[PDB]
């Protein structure tokens, strides 16, 4: 499925880990803010702001990377409430002319990071926890921290 062959959507029986990501951009009063975080259930492993002007689509690529990324040589469950993220993530061919191009850059060559992947696409759960965890963490980076750049 997309450019890496083994990539599944449903989860792995075996991972070493089970992560939840999201990117965050809220308007506030006018001005536009921005964050991005990868956690487990319960714990926030990774968070920061965004560069001010960053959209919801850009951020929510640079947490599925950064996931990606950190799981480098290892077996990972990764989940992403985005469909755009879900969808690009099995692009096999693009243009230069589209839009965030150095992020999904970023995005197809950390695919094959992982030793094993499987990113999934979305309650009281487990996963419902997990995914109102790294949505509460992006936001919380973007409301009260500052960006590295600009
Ligand atoms: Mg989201």
Same mark, same amino acid.
């Given at each position: 499925?997309?450019?890496?062959?083994?990539?599944?959507?449903?989860?792995?029986?075996d991972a070493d880990h089970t992560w939840?990501?999201?990117?965050?951009?809220?308007?506030?009063?006018?001005?536009?803010?921005?964050?991005?975080?990868?956690?487990?259930?319960?714990?926030?492993?990774?968070?920061?702001?965004?560069?001010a002007g960053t959209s919801a689509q850009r951020a929510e690529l640079i947490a599925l990377t950064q996931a990606l990324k950190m799981a480098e040589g290892k077996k990972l469950?990764?989940?992403?409430?985005? +469909?755009?993220?879900?969808?690009?993530a099995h692009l096999t061919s693009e243009g230069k002319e589209i839009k965030?191009?150095?992020?999904?850059?970023?995005?197809?060559?950390?695919?094959?990071?992982?030793?094993?992947?499987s990113i999934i696409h979305c309650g009281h759960s487990?996963?419902? +926890?997990?995914n109102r965890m790294a949505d509460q963490a992006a936001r919380k980076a973007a409301i009260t921290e500052t960006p590295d750049t600009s």
């Open positions: 499925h997309g450019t890496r062959p083994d990539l599944t959507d449903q989860p792995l029986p939840y990501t999201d990117g965050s951009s809220l308007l506030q009063e006018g001005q536009r803010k921005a964050g991005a975080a990868v956690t487990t259930e319960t714990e926030v492993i990774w968070a920061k702001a965004l560069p469950n990764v989940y992403t409430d985005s +469909r755009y993220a879900f969808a690009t965030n191009k150095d992020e999904i850059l970023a995005l197809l060559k950390a695919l094959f990071l992982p030793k094993r992947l487990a996963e419902a +926890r997990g």
